[PDB]
Design a binder for this molecule. Structure first.
Ligand SMILES: *[C@@H]1O[C@H](CO)[C@@H](O)[C@H](O)[C@H]1NC(C)=O
Ligand SMILES: *[C@@H]1O[C@H](CO)[C@@H](O)[C@H](O)[C@H]1NC(C)=O
Ligand SMILES: *[C@@H]1O[C@H](CO)[C@@H](O)[C@H](O)[C@H]1NC(C)=O
Ligand SMILES: *[C@@H]1O[C@H](CO)[C@@H](O)[C@H](O)[C@H]1NC(C)=O
Ligand SMILES: *[C@@H]1O[C@H](CO)[C@@H](O)[C@H](O)[C@H]1NC(C)=O
Ligand SMILES: *[C@@H]1O[C@H](CO)[C@@H](O)[C@H](O)[C@H]1NC(C)=O
Lengths: 96, 96, 192, 76, 48, 48
C-alpha cells in the first residue's frame, strides 16, 4: 500500500510524506518492447524490436508471435450505415 | 499587490473626456485609448515591486473605454507543478 | 497511433514576447518538426502580418526559424501575426475539417510610453550555471524630445529580484555613438 | 528638478533582512534623505544620509521587525 | 465659380478614413473634422 | 401532423398507402404534414 508519515512540531503544521510499498513479486518473464508510438501514413515497414529476459538476466528461447490489426470505420449500422468496412484485415507473424 | 485581502493599490487616475477636440499638426483629433495595453505599471504589479516616482508611468485612460472585461484571466503562468506524477505503467519490482 | 499531419509548426512560448514596442523589431521564432518530434532540413515558412505574406523565411537546419518583423510606424492595437508552412509537396491529410496546411497564430498587444522610448530584454530559454557571470542582452529605442537632445549618454538602472529580496543591483551607462538605437550587455553575476 | 525612485518589494518577509533601493537624481545642491518604514509604533532608519553630488543610486539592507500576523505598513 | 453653367471647380480632395489611430505626444487620437469651417478656399471662391 | 406521430399506417401491397387526417377543429394556417419511413432494419447509407 501507501503508508503515510505525519509529523507535528512546535513550528510546522504537518510534515506529510508518502510511501509506495509494494508486494515483492517477481514474474519469471519480462518482455521489453519500444513501440514507435506514432506512424505516418506513407510508411510501408513497421519495425518492432522485442527482447525478453528472466528475473536474473537470462535469455529466453521460445516463440515470439505478433498479431496487429484494427477496425475500419464502425459508422453504427442499421438506420445508420448497415454494412461497413471489414472485420479489419488482421495480419500475423511469428519468429524464434 | 493583493496580499491577505489588502489592496495596497493607489486609486485610478482621473478619466479624461472623449469629446475635447485637440489639434496636432493636421486634422482635428478626438482622444481615445483601448482597454488592454501595456505600460510600466503593468510590467510592474506583476513582478510585485512598488514605485513612488513622480514621473509619469501609468497609461492614460479615457471614459467609455475603461478596463471592463470582468476578470481577463487566461492560463496565466504555464505552470509545471502538480501532483500524482505517475501513470499506470506498472514497472513491478523486478530486482533483488 | 497512426498520425496524419506529417508536418507541424509551433510557437515556442519562451521567446516571442507578447508586447511589441514601436521601433524595436518584433522577433518571431518558430519550431518546425515532423511526425515523432524530429528537426527538418531547409524549409520555407510564410509570415503573414495581417493579411499579406511578407517574410518567406527559410529554416536553419534545426527547425529554429527566426524572423524580425519591422515594427516602426505600427500604431494598431491587435496585430495578429500568423505563420504557415506552405509547400505544395507536403502530405497533410487532415481529419477534423481544419485548414489544409500547418498554421499557427499569435495575438500580441502594444506597449505604451508617452514621450516615445522602449526597453526590451532578449530573454533566456536555458538555465544559467552558478559561478559564471552572464550577459543577458537588452535592446533599446530612445527617441528625440525624450532624454534631451545634445547629450549622447544614457544610464540604465538595473535590478534583480531573487525570492523577495532586491539583490545584485547595478548601473550601466552607454554612449550614444550612433543616433538612437543599439544594444548593451549587462554583466549579470549569477551566484548561488 | 528632482526625480526620485523608491524600490522595495510589496510583501516584506518578517524576520529576514531585505534591501531597499533609492534613485535620487536631478538635484544640484547637497540634500538630506530619509527612508522610514512606519511600523505600528516604531520608526525604522533605512536611510538617514546627507546626499552628495547628484546620481545618488544607493541601496541598503534593513531588518523587518517580527510580526505574527500579516499586516499593512507604510514607507515614507 | 459657377458662371453660365460651367463649374470651373477642381475635384474634391480624397477622403481620409475615420479609424486610423494616430499618435501625437500623449493619448491616442482618431481624426475628425467639422462640416462647416473656414479656410483659404472659402476665403477665395467668394471674391472669385 | 405537426410534431406528433398519429397515423402509423401500413401499405396496401403495391405502395399506395392512404391515410385520412381528421381536420375538424383545425384553425391553424400552415399545417405542414410530413411522412417518414421508419423501420430500424433497412439500409439508408446517405451521402449528402
Ligand atoms: C495468425 O493467427 C491467426 C489466428 O486466427 C491464424 O489464423 C493465422 O494463420 C496466423 N498467421 C499465420 C501466418 O499462420
Ligand atoms: C483585434 O481587433 C479585431 C477587430 O476586428 C478583432 O477581430 C480581433 O479579435 C481582436 N483581437 C486580436 C487578437 O486580433
Ligand atoms: C558577455 O558578452 C560581452 C560582449 O562584449 C562580453 O564583454 C562579456 O565578457 C560576456 N560575458 C561572459 C562571456 O560571461
Ligand atoms: C559575483 O559575486 C561574488 C560575491 O561577491 C564575487 O565573489 C564574484 O567575484 C562575482 N563575480 C565576478 C565575475 O566577479
Ligand atoms: C516617527 O514616525 C512618526 C509617525 O509614526 C512620524 O512623526 C515620523 O516619521 C517619526 N518621528 C520621529 C520624531 O521620529
Ligand atoms: C547605508 O548607506 C549609508 C550612506 O551613508 C552607508 O554609510 C552605509 O554603509 C550603508 N549601509 C548600512 C548597513 O547602513
Amino acid at each position: 500500500g501507501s503508508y503515510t508519515i505525519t509529523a507535528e512540531g512546535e513550528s510546522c503544521e504537518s510534515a506529510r510524506q508518502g510511501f509506495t510499498v509494494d508486494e515483492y513479486i517477481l514474474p519469471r518473464f519480462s518482455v521489453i518492447v519500444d513501440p514507435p508510438n506514432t506512424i505516418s501514413i506513407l510508411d510501408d515497414i513497421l519495425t518492432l524490436n522485442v527482447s525478453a529476459i528472466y528475473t536474473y538476466g537470462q535469455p529466453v528461447p521460445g516463440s515470439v508471435t505478433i498479431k496487429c490489426c484494427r477496425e475500419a470505420s464502425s459508422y453504427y449500422g442499421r438506420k445508420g450505415n448497415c454494412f461497413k468496412g471489414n472485420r479489419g484485415i488482421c495480419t500475423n507473424i511469428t519468429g524464434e | 499587490y493583493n496580499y491577505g485581502g489588502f489592496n495596497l493599490e493607489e486609486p485610478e487616475p482621473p478619466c479624461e473626456d472623449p469629446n475635447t477636440v485637440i489639434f496636432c499638426k493636421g486634422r482635428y483629433y478626438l482622444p481615445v485609448s483601448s482597454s488592454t495595453e501595456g505600460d510600466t505599471y503593468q510590467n510592474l504589479r506583476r513582478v510585485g515591486l512598488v514605485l513612488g516616482t513622480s514621473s509619469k508611468i501609468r497609461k492614460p485612460v479615457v471614459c467609455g473605454m475603461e478596463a471592463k472585461f470582468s476578470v481577463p484571466r487566461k492560463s496565466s503562468g504555464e505552470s509545471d507543478f502538480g501532483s500524482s506524477l505517475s501513470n499506470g505503467h506498472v514497472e513491478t519490482l523486478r530486482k533483488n | 497511433m497512426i498520425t496524419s499531419q506529417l508536418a507541424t509548426l509551433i510557437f515556442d512560448y519562451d521567446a516571442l514576447k507578447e508586447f511589441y514596442k514601436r521601433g524595436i523589431p518584433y522577433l518571431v521564432k518558430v519550431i518546425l518538426t515532423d511526425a515523432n518530434d524530429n528537426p527538418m532540413a531547409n524549409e520555407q515558412v510564410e509570415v503573414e502580418l495581417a493579411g499579406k505574406t511578407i517574410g518567406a523565411v527559410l529554416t536553419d537546419k534545426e527547425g529554429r526559424a527566426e524572423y524580425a518583423i519591422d515594427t516602426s510606424s505600427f500604431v494598431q492595437e491587435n496585430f495578429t501575426v500568423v505563420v504557415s508552412y506552405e509547400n505544395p509537396h507536403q502530405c497533410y491529410y487532415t481529419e477534423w475539417e481544419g485548414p489544409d496546411f500547418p498554421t499557427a497564430q499569435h495575438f500580441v498587444m502594444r506597449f505604451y510610453s508617452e514621450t516615445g522610448s522602449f526597453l526590451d530584454i532578449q530573454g533566456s530559454s536555458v538555465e544559467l550555471n552558478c559561478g559564471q557571470v552572464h550577459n543577458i542582452s537588452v535592446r533599446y529605442i530612445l527617441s528625440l524630445d525624450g532624454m534631451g537632445e545634445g547629450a549622447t549618454t544614457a544610464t540604465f538602472y538595473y535590478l534583480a529580484m531573487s525570492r523577495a529580496k532586491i539583490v545584485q543591483h547595478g548601473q550601466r551607462d552607454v554612449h550614444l555613438n550612433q543616433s538612437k538605437s543599439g544594444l548593451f550587455n549587462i554583466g549579470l553575476n549569477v551566484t548561488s | 528638478k528632482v526625480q526620485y525612485a523608491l524600490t522595495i518589494p510589496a510583501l516584506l518577509k518578517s524576520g529576514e533582512t531585505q534591501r531597499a533601493c533609492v534613485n535620487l537624481i536631478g538635484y544640484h545642491q547637497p540634500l538630506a534623505l530619509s527612508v522610514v518604514l512606519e511600523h505600528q509604533r516604531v520608526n525604522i532608519s533605512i536611510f538617514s544620509e546627507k546626499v552628495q553630488p547628484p546620481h545618488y543610486f544607493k541601496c541598503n539592507k534593513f531588518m523587518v521587525p517580527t510580526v505574527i500576523t500579516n499586516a499593512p505598513d507604510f514607507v515614507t
